[PDB]
Amino acid sequence: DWGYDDKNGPEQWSKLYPIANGNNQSPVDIKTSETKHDTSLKPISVSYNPATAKEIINVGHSFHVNFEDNDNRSVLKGGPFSDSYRLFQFHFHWGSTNEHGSEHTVDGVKYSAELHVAHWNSAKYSSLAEAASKADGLAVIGVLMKVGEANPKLQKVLDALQAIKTKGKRAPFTNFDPSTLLPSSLDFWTYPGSLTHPPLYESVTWIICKESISVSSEQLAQFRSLLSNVEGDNAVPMQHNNRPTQPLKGRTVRASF
Ligand SMILES: CC1(C)OC(c2ccc(S(N)(=O)=O)cc2)=C(c2cccc(F)c2)C1=O
Ligand SMILES: CC1(C)OC(c2ccc(S(N)(=O)=O)cc2)=C(c2cccc(F)c2)C1=O
Numbered sequence: 618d619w620g621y622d623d624k625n626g627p628e629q630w631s632k633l634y635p636i637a638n639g640n641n642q643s644p645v646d647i648k649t650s651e652t653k654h655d656t657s658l659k660p661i662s663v664s665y666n667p668a669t670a671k672e673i674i675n676v677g678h679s680f681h682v683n684f685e686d687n688d689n690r691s692v693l694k695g696g697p698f699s700d701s702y703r704l705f706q707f708h709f710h711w712g713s714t715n716e717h718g719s720e721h722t723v724d725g726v727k728y729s730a731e732l733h734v735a736h737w738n739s740a741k742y743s744s745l746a747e748a749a750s751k752a753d754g755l756a757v758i759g760v761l762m763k764v765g766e767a768n769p770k771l772q773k774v775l776d777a778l779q780a781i782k783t784k785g786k787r788a789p790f791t792n793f794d795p796s797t798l799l800p801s802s803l804d805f806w807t808y809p810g811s812l813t814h815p816p817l818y819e820s821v822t823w824i825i826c827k828e829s830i831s832v833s834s835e836q837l838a839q840f841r842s843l844l845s846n847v848e849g850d851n852a853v854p855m856q857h858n859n860r861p862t863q864p865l866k867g868r869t870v871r872a873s874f
């Protein structure tokens with residue numbers, strides 16, 4: 618139903634998903650003059666087991682790399698968290714052009730694309746499903762991506778894309794540690810927010826990295842070469858899937874630095 622186009626995109630979401638106009642919506646513009654340093658913030662600690670990598674799948678508006686959810690082999694802790702959060706997938710957002718495709722912005726600056734590494738609170742909840750709509754249910758690391766030099770760490774992901782050309786296509790995807798996609802500095806901002814597309818639950822603690830990572834124009838072109846349609850239908854390229862930033866509505870963005 619929803620999407621990113623002229624008829625079903627972000628401007629239209631609040632019709633079926635009224636929380637689109639909520640007070641903890643994501644993404645946001647991080648104004649660095651207005652962030653608050655939090656000395657009680659601990660360093661971010663991620664520990665992912667490459668063996669938890671399971672599959673890669675075209676979900677129509679995007680593609681996802683899913684991880685096995687059985688145990689806490691791959692976890693995120695530290696930062697603002699009391700609980701350990703279990704990794705369950707990562708994915709990207711990008712734009713119609715190579716220069717304008719991220720979701721979060723920093724001091725009004727839009728980046729080329731964005732990496733999201735999603736986790737759920739398995740310490741407190743029974744399942745991803747139970748956590749999905751709890752204020753403290755999900756944790757997502759966002760990394761801003763800036764077009765420039767090719768990023769060698771993306772290669773395994775990119776090579777898999779030809780195996781998931783149309784909506785619903787899935788392929789095995791194993792032995793990969795997405796922490797290798799993270800920048801060297803783990804300075805970060807954090808703020809309370811939401812999924813950046815429907816159902817838009819305000820269930821997400823966001824961790825946004827201070828440093829960007831690279832991506833080349835040719836690599837972004839591989840993202841856009843995916844199709845949003847089901848095989849057999851007319852081809853619709855997966856051209857863009859980033860949401861505009863949303864008002865902070867009183868929220869405070871905390872900085873670890
Ligand atoms: C909108 C609705 C019902 O939700 C999902 C979906 C939910 C959660 C996650 S995830 N990986 O947990 O974030 C990913 C996808 C799909 C979906 C799943 C596989 C292939 C596909 F083409 C679509 C849907 O059709
Ligand atoms: C299977 C999986 C991952 O789980 C949930 C989900 C489960 C339970 C609850 S809750 N907290 O019980 O209301 C909330 C969400 C969805 C889901 C995805 C898109 C739209 C939607 F409405 C639900 C999924 O695709």
Ligand SMILES: CC1(C)OC(c2ccc(S(N)(=O)=O)cc2)=C(c2cccc(F)c2)C1=O
Nearest residue numbers: 676733735745749757811812813814815816
């Ligand atoms: C609640 C639960 C498990 O989480 C997500 C989800 C996670 C992270 C982000 S994001 N872009 O990082 O904020 C956005 C959405 C979905 C989901 C729903 C519909 C389609 C889909 F592909 C995924 C879910 O069903």
Ligand SMILES: [Zn+2]
Nearest residue numbers: 708710733813
């Ligand atoms: Zn995302």
